[PDB]
Design a protein around this ligand. Structure first.
Ligand SMILES: [Zn+2]
Lengths: 415, 4
């Protein structure tokens, strides 16, 4: 073309996509913000689900969350655009200087990159917990706990990041010409290792983990565990009351159950807790856990393959300001976080659609166990506990909501 | 997976 450039065109394409996706999500955010402002009256369908006092408490909470979501989101989108345009990343790469040498430079660049990321986002994080979560009486955290936890998490992150990054960069630089297969198999091992280690060693460092005390709930759970042939080791009661009044539950293994102390206490009755367990046990029995891993490793193989195909192109490096050298870590950032952006956005939308279908299947499994009436009462009680707005814009919930709306889940259980 |  005697009218358009090459490297400057692909850089513009990245930013043009990043802004259209942002404007799409902002249009969606505006569409749902209107729902919070318009629907001031309790609907006749969700009339028995929520009362006028709880509905208005939920209306203002989701409204304050929406306002923050915009400005915190806008700052991020502006920062990203400004760092790229100003040429922050290549200049930050230069200041982290002065195969082992490139890996060391990549390691210090990463240490500096994550340090700025953590510090710039910390005031926004501090606002959410101490202004939004505190105004609507959810937060139970002190400024000291928040600060001590932020450092705790940042330290633990770097101690996992640096050795994994150094070994991954080593495999790409040393290995070849089919380096992407060993690099994909390395991430495959690192994924399964960190999954088993996390809940047993990493997770108890930030939150107090204690096994469920013996009682009517503990005995009935073992009866249910033996019934579904679930290899239960122990049930855990996570001290989530030290952070916030929010209630939830999860499960892990290679097996142990994880339930919030806010859900057990106020919370949900023992009959409702067992129904919530029956739903979570559904993801194990229906193989939702195994299916999600198969998708994640299929995605990384496709990504590493296209990376190996595009790493050789010097045009993508020159686009973002890298002319003198083509660094490996920089190649991973440009291709995985910018070139793959359209694919990553489509895949995320497809996985959100799948997550909703996986939740309906786990709810259907809870009904198949007979605890349908108990789960119906639990879902409503947990919605009041977390001040969840029952009304939602269809276009917003279809794109963002990993869990289907309360009214949709309740109607499937009633049937 | 989760509940909420
Ligand atoms: Zn679930």
């Amino acid at each position: 073309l005697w009218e358009m450039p090459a490297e400057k065109r692909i850089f513009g394409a990245v930013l043009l996509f990043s802004w259209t996706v942002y404007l799409w999500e902002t249009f969606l955010a505006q569409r749902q913000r209107r729902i919070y402002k318009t629907t001031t009256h309790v609907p006749p369908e969700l009339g028995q689900i929520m009362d006028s006092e709880t509905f208005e408490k939920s209306r203002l909470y989701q409204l304050d969350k929406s306002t923050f979501s915009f400005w915190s989101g806008l700052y991020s989108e502006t920062e990203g655009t400004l760092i790229l345009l100003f040429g922050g990343i290549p200049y930050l790469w230069r200041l982290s200087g002065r195969p082992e040498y490139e890996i060391t430079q990549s390691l210090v660049f990463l240490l500096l990159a994550t340090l700025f990321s953590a510090l710039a986002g910390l005031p926004w994080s501090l606002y959410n917990t101490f202004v939004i979560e505190e105004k609507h009486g959810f937060n139970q955290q002190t400024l000291g706990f928040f600060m001590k936890d932020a450092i705790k998490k940042f330290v633990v992150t770097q101690c996992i990041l640096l050795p994994v990054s150094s070994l991954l960069l080593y495999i790409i630089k040393i290995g070849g010409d089919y380096f992407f297969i060993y690099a994909w198999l390395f991430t495959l091992v690192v994924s399964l290792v960190l999954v088993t280690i996390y809940a047993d060693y990493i997770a108890p460092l930030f939150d107090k983990f204690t096994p469920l005390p013996e009682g009517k709930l503990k005995e009935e759970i073992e009866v249910m565990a033996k019934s579904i042939d679930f290899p239960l080791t122990k049930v855990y009661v996570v001290e989530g009351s030290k952070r916030s009044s929010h209630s939830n539950a999860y499960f892990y293994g290679f097996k142990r159950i994880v339930l919030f102390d806010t859900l057990l206490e106020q919370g949900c009755k023992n009959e409702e807790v067992l129904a919530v367990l029956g739903h979570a046990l559904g993801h194990w029995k229906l193989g939702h856990t195994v299916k999600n891993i198969i998708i994640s490793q299929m995605n990384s193989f496709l990504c590493f393959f296209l990376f190996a195909v595009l790493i050789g192109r010097k045009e993508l490096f020159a686009a973002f300001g890298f002319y003198d050298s083509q660094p490996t870590l920089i190649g991973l950032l440009i291709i995985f976080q910018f070139i793959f952006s359209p694919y990553n956005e489509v895949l995320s939308f497809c996985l959100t659609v799948l997550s909703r279908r996986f939740e309906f299947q786990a709810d259907a499994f809870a009904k198949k166990l007979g605890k349908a009436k108990d789960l119906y009462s639990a879902l409503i009680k947990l919605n009041k506990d977390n001040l969840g707005f029952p009304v939602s814009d269809w276009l917003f919930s279809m794109w963002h909501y990993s869990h289907p709306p309360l009214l949709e889940r309740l109607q499937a259980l009633k049937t | 997976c989760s509940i909420m």
